Amino acid sequence: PSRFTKTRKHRGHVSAGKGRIGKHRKHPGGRGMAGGQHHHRINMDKYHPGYFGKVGMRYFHKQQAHFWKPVLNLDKLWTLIPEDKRDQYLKSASKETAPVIDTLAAGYGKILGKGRIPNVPVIVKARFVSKLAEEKIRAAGGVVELIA
Amino acid sequence: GAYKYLEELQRKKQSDVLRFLQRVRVWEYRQKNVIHRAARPTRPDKARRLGYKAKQGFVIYRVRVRRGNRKRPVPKGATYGKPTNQGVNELKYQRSLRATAEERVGRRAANLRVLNSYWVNQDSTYKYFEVILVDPQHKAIRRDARYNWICDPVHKHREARGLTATGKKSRGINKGHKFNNTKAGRRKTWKRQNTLSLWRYRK
Amino acid sequence: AISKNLPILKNHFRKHWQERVKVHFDQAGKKVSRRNARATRAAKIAPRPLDLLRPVVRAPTVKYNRKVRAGRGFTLAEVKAAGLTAAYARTIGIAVDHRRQNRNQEIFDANVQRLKEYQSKIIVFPRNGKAPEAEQVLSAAATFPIAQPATDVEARAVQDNGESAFRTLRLARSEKKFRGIREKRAREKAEAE
Amino acid sequence: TVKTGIAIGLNKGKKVTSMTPAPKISYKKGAASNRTKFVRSLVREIAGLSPYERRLIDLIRNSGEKRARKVAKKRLGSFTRAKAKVEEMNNIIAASRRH
Amino acid sequence: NDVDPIELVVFLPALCKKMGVPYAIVKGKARLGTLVNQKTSAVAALTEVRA
RNA sequence: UUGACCUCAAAUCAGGUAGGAGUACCCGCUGAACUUAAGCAUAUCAAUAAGCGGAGGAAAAGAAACCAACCGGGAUUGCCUUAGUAACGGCGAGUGAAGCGGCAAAAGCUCAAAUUUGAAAUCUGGUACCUUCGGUGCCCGAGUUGUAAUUUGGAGAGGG
RNA sequence: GUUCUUUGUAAAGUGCCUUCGAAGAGUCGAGUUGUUUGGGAAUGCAGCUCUAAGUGGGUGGUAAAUUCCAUCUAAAGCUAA
Ligand SMILES: [K+]
Ligand SMILES: [K+]
Ligand SMILES: [Mg+2]
Ligand SMILES: [Mg+2]
Ligand SMILES: [Mg+2]
Ligand SMILES: [Mg+2]
Ligand SMILES: [Mg+2]
Ligand SMILES: [Mg+2]
Ligand SMILES: [Mg+2]
Ligand SMILES: [Mg+2]
Ligand SMILES: [Mg+2]
Ligand SMILES: [Mg+2]
Ligand SMILES: [Mg+2]
Ligand SMILES: [Mg+2]
Ligand SMILES: [Mg+2]
Ligand SMILES: [Mg+2]
Ligand SMILES: [Mg+2]
Ligand SMILES: [Mg+2]
Ligand SMILES: [Mg+2]
Ligand SMILES: [Mg+2]
Ligand SMILES: [Mg+2]
Ligand SMILES: [Mg+2]
Ligand SMILES: [Mg+2]
Ligand SMILES: [Mg+2]
């Protein structure tokens, strides 16, 4: 809304808030990223260290789908179970009839081990697992089954 | 048939027989006019492969095209620009000599439609092509459903629009990653990639 | 023009970009037009569901191979195993894809089964009969919806054997990494003069 | 060629029941075709050798197959084409006087 | 003997020699055309001849 | 001497066709510089403006010498994404796609290369008649240096 | 929808057995030059020089030799939304 802008408030003030000495000229410092190495060096180096130069090796024709691997931490590991069934799976923490969790079908590629899970066996089907993720899943009496 | 033998023989162009025939025929073509009607295909198997049929309404024209690069036609080599554009003598005319040949033939026989063309000969100065054209007014062509597609007005001067084989080749019309710049048309792809799409509910 | 602490921007507007600005003002008009075209095409064609039966098919590129989706057309093998010829299937409303091949018996059986279900749920009107007007249903995809196959059960018995799945992944990766080097070492250790 | 069932390693991938689809008639575009063999033999006998093929046969008989293959790679596109051309030229030499 | 694009018949003597079929190079595609009720014929073959 | 054939001509020969306009969009060719880089030459502007040739109601593209590397997808086109990303770049200023995925729309195909060889089965034209976007008969001609039928790789063909 | 037609022992599809299975060349490809592309030991295009093969050929985004594999089938053509 233009009626709320400060240019309505500058009506009647000659310089429109842009100053009498240093006016609003066209491009006093160059256009875009001009002079990032010469007269904007301080502003480049502070607030943008690492901007100039090369830092690694190239990858021609990189496809992100090759690297698609969403990570799910152990601290959730149960939001993948339906809310209704989750209570009766938490109760009756049996080595038999343990709930099977398809993490790939849920949309994850690697299971990480951030949190801690309740001491109830769970059958975790994943493509990849962290070492500590598998250790915690096994300490809870469950197992990790590798899929693809 | 004999067309298989013709096809295999035409691939031995540095054999004694084809070298002799090449020399004799290139001399004859050079003695004839730059563009002139050919009474029959010089390579009937090649014409059949390219869609020619020995019926009324199919026409062969022989055409001679100057070889080499496209010299920039600026006066005295002055380009009046930046040094990256100062080039005059190593510029290559991003369109085939075959395309130039069939365009000149189509301009001569504007009543016909350029169906295809094939190389027949060459010397250092000239490249020689035979252009197969179809008569879209001939009833043998307007009937015969295999060929009356070319009677449609959408096929007017397809050699001048790059819709023949050499035209599509020079336009880069092919499938796959090597032709991302030119798959649906170079300038059409560029327009699509340089269009700013703004919906009513801005995304 | 490098001001205070702000992210570097990459706004690509240095060409004559205003000459190509497509504002989709016609979104609602085009939606009305697409619906009108669907209605007239449905009225034009015989009672016929506005689209061909499509096969079930696995998406490529492991990001998506976990899910199943509609493909272009049924393979020649699938049509033959369903008991039709490709030409007649194309005339009775089945999309046929000569390019696709069957290397997966699950997908093949699923496509043959949905072809059989389609044949048992369509009535083909004879060219010289009566076939009273049969209440065209507009969607074949809604009538034969693609179902994601179920792989496992909700609950099962833990069968841990002590294999350390993480170690299994590490060892598979190491075996791949050294397969060629160990192969060439076993090539050069078979020297035996 | 069976998948191992896991997402890493040599034969990674899901274990699916294989089918071995019927062979396409494409993938046989460069096939044997007794007709082509006859026609090409006749044309090879009526048209002679090309000049570079004559030079290549000379190099095979006088300077060795490595020099011949170098020259054939210079003449034709690639090393595979050079190799095939040199085998064809020495087959010609073997069908020639040194039967 | 006068086929204007001669590649159409240059392999014919060799084809006939390889298949053991007698051949004669004769003057006149016009004459062969008169044989076969055409303007030109460029070839004329006998496969069966009466007793 | 006569009759062809091939090639090439001529006719105010019979019948047709092309040009020019428009040119918003479309298919190509040709092609800058201002500009940005706080200078400037590569770069950028821009594979743009100007110039030239050629279409339609759409054009073009289009049924893979494709994408992929998967448990594989399956003509083309367009939208949302991919993605201001892989990459390019005095690696500076800047530039910058594609595969997958969701959707709109969906549609598939045909020639060449085959001996009809127990039958050029093919076709333009002229003419007479008719039920005239054409049909039949007749007659020239085209065409075997190949016009029909049959096959197009998904196949398919010859035999039982 | 109604009615004269009746196409045609013509045409097409389908199983099994067997022999085959033709598939495009100054083209692909290569070198070099120029242009162009995000395409980077070279993305396309074009000129010149070289110039293929048929269990071949193209592609598989780092040049090369070797060994495999995968995927298509170019150098001819039509097609609505
Ligand atoms: K200021
Ligand atoms: K200039
Ligand atoms: Mg004040
Ligand atoms: Mg002031
Ligand atoms: Mg003629
Ligand atoms: Mg020139
Ligand atoms: Mg007149
Ligand atoms: Mg400006
Ligand atoms: Mg400047
Ligand atoms: Mg300035
Ligand atoms: Mg200046
Ligand atoms: Mg313009
Ligand atoms: Mg118009
Ligand atoms: Mg439209
Ligand atoms: Mg079109
Ligand atoms: Mg195809
Ligand atoms: Mg596609
Ligand atoms: Mg993002
Ligand atoms: Mg650019
Ligand atoms: Mg048939
Ligand atoms: Mg081909
Ligand atoms: Mg240019
Ligand atoms: Mg094609
Ligand atoms: Mg087209």
> What are the residues whose beta carbons fall under 8 Å from the beta carbon of C128, sequence distance 6 or more?
none
Q: C-alpha angle with apex A31: A27 to A37, nearest 5 degrees?
A: 115
Residue partners of A23: CB distance under 8 A and separation at least 6: A15
Q: Could you give the CA distance from residue C24 to residue C37 in angstroms, rounded to a whole number?
A: 19
CA distances from B151 to B108, B147, B166, E12 (A): 18, 8, 21, 39
Write out which nucleotides of chain G lie closer than 7 A to a protein Cβ: 1, 13-15, 20-30, 33-40, 43-62, 64-66, 71-73, 75-79
A147 near D CB under 8 A = yes
Question: Closest to D50 (Cβ–Cβ): which among B4, B9, B12?
Answer: B12
Shortest CA distance to E10 belongs to which of E43, E46, E34, E38? E43
Across the interface, do B40 and E10 touch by the CB < 8 Å criterion?
no
Strand F contact with B194 (CB < 7 A): yes
Which nucleotide's C1' sits nearest to the alpha carbon of B115?
A: G77
Residue indicated by tokens 């009498």 = A20
Q: Scan for tokens 């069934």, then name that residue.
A: A85
Taken in order of first residue, the domains within chain D and their CATH numbers are 16-99 (1.10.10.1760)
SS3 C190: coil
Residues of D with Cβ-Cβ distance to E18 under 8 angstroms: 42
Q: Which one, of C107, B49, C101, B174, lies nearest residue D27 by Cα?
A: C101
Q: How far is CA A84 from CA A78, A87, A140, C114, in A?
A: 11, 6, 21, 33
Residue B174's SS3 state is coil
- Look up residue B151 and give its two tokens: 């009677």
Helices in B59-185 by DSSP H: which ranges?
Answer: 97-108, 139-142, 158-161, 165-171
Structure tokens at D89: 């030229």
D58 forms beta bridges with none
Nucleic strand F within 7 A of Cβ B75: no
Q: Where do we find the tokens 């085009």?
A: C30
CA-angle at C122, arms to C117 and C127, nearest 5°: 145
- Residue E23 CB partners (closer than 8 Å, separation 6+): E12, E13, E16, E17
Residues 1-51 of E with CB under 7 A from strand F: 2-5, 8, 28-30, 33-34, 36, 38-43, 47-48
Cα three-residue angle A52-A53-A57, rounded to 5 degrees: 140
Asked if residues B159 and B128 have their Cβ atoms less than 8 Å apart, the reply is no
- Contact pairs from chain B to chain E, CB under 8 Å: 21
Token digits of residue D66: 């490595």
Nearest to D19 among C105, C169, C175 (CB): C105
Cβ of C101 under 8 Å from any chain D Cβ? yes
What is residue C8's DSSP assignment? P
Record: contact A43-C64, CB cut-off 8 A: no
Query: Cα–Cα distances in Å, from B9 out to A73, B42, D41?
Result: 70, 13, 11
- Method of elucidation: cryo-EM
Residue B113, strand partner residues: B134
The answer to whether the CB of B115 falls within 8 A of the CB of B52 is yes
The phi, psi pair for E47, rounded to 5°, reads: -105, -40
Q: Tokens for D13, please give them.
A: 């991938």
Are D47 and B5 inside 8 Å of each other by CB? no
Distance CA C99, CA C75 (A): 7
CA distance B6 to chain E (A): 7
The CB-side HSE value for B158 (13 A sphere, CA atoms) comes to 21
CATH number at residue B74: 3.40.1120.10
Are the C-beta atoms of B137 and B59 separated by less than 8 Å? no
Spanning CA of A148 to C1' of F95, the rounded length in angstroms is: 39
Q: Is the CB of B193 under 7 A from strand G?
A: no
> What total number of domains does chain B contain?
1
For B5, the domain range is 1-203
Could you tell me where the beta strands, DSSP code E, fall in chain A? Answer: 71-73, 98-102, 110-112, 123-126, 128-129, 143-146
| Pairwise CA distance, residues C76 & C78, whole Å | 5
* Nucleotides on strand F lying under 7 Å from protein C-beta: 3-9, 15-19, 26-34, 36-39, 41-48, 53-88, 91-115, 117-118, 123-125, 141-148, 153-156
